[PDB]
Amino acid sequence: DIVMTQTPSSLPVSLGDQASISCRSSQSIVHSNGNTYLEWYLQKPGQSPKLLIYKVSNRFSGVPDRFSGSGSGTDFTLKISRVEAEDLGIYYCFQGSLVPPTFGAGTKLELKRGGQVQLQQSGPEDVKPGASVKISCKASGYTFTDYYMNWVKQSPGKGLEWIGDINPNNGGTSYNQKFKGRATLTVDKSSSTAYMELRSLTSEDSSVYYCAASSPYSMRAAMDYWGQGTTVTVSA
């Protein structure tokens, strides 16, 4: 099993200064075919996490060129020069190269002190120990059947985790073995919706849930979301 190590946990940098974040895997994440799928995501506190970099060094559309990072094998290094206030947030490295795709521990980018397409999600859910939940994700503004649908669990405590993915065509679900398919990804192409179910609910199961959507990143689809999210609280 592959583990992702993100360094450092937190970093202070004043405006304009260089910024560098190292992501070191357990071993080579180079895909057998000869590609390498590694992404850089930015979580702006109180918003949708969105994609910055896909496929090693390739920048996502609409992203400033001051964001650039490279690497191979294990080592991958993301640099940001000319830091502004919109560059602020907690960054995550993500490998989709080997199943299960894993995330980094995140790095809060903070400051030194001194001197239209979108996917709607269901409302927040309050639940009891073991009750189910069906989370609905409705796509708007793009071709639904084009993109795979990943799901991602987010806690302040246990960070980011990949739930599982599904192919809109054949219901091509592939689930994280930690989740053991105890959750279920379904797709109704009629209204273009991707639901998600889960039964057993513990304290640790309490989290926010996002539905991963958007591409290109050649000859594979659907990495970043890039949408609202749904707060699920397990109430004792």
Side-chain angles (χ1 to χ4, degrees):
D1 186 28
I2 311 298
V3 60
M4 294 289 275
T5 325
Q6 207 169 312
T7 298
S9 41
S10 167
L11 188 145
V13 147
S14 269
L15 298 95
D17 303 319
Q18 208 65 230
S20 198
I21 299 172
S22 288
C23 194
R24 210 174 180 105
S25 74
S26 82
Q27 48 192 351
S28 180
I29 67 154
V30 182
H31 194 284
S32 68
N33 60 21
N35 276 32
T36 304
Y37 301 89
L38 168 138
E39 275 68 63
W40 288 102
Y41 291 105
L42 160 69
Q43 169 88 62
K44 289 178 180 287
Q47 256 187 43
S48 314
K50 281 159 192 173
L51 181 60
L52 314 158
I53 291 181
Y54 60 96
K55 198 202 297 165
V56 184
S57 25
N58 304 37
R59 295 186 271 105
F60 187 71
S61 170
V63 179
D65 61 337
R66 319 173 287 98
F67 299 86
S68 293
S70 279
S72 69
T74 54
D75 296 339
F76 298 93
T77 299
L78 175 51
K79 280 200 171 180
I80 312 167
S81 59
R82 312 160 187 105
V83 184
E84 308 158 335
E86 299 151 8
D87 299 355
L88 267 292
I90 163 161
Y91 290 77
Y92 303 85
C93 69
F94 156 73
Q95 66 90 2
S97 283
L98 186 73
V99 156
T102 38
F103 280 99
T107 296
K108 184 93 178 153
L109 183 271
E110 54 191 342
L111 224 120
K112 295 177 161 180
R113 298 277 195 179
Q116 55 172 332
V117 44
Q118 51 193 136
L119 304 85
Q120 287 79 28
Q121 288 198 25
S122 64
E125 316 266 327
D126 280 18
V127 276
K128 309 283 274 187
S132 278
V133 51
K134 187 181 192 182
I135 303 166
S136 307
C137 175
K138 194 206 180 302
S140 68
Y142 72 96
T143 319
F144 177 54
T145 176
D146 276 12
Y147 297 76
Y148 278 85
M149 212 60 114
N150 310 271
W151 286 86
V152 52
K153 169 204 190 62
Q154 146 65 29
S155 176
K158 54 200 298 179
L160 283 187
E161 284 167 61
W162 180 75
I163 300 164
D165 80 318
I166 186 179
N167 169 32
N169 189 288
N170 47 7
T173 67
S174 170
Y175 297 112
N176 205 328
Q177 266 291 329
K178 254 84 182 292
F179 285 15
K180 300 149 167 64
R182 301 181 299 100
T184 312
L185 265 56
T186 55
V187 161
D188 165 71
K189 288 195 276 179
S190 174
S191 75
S192 154
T193 321
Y195 313 99
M196 197 252 299
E197 292 104 348
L198 181 55
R199 183 60 176 177
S200 283
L201 296 180
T202 76
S203 308
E204 290 169 8
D205 279 30
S206 317
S207 274
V208 200
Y209 294 94
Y210 295 88
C211 174
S214 41
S215 229
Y217 81 112
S218 188
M219 52 168 62
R220 205 53 196 179
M223 65 217 336
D224 66 276
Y225 180 79
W226 152 283
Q228 289 198 339
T230 299
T231 311
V232 170
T233 316
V234 186
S235 172

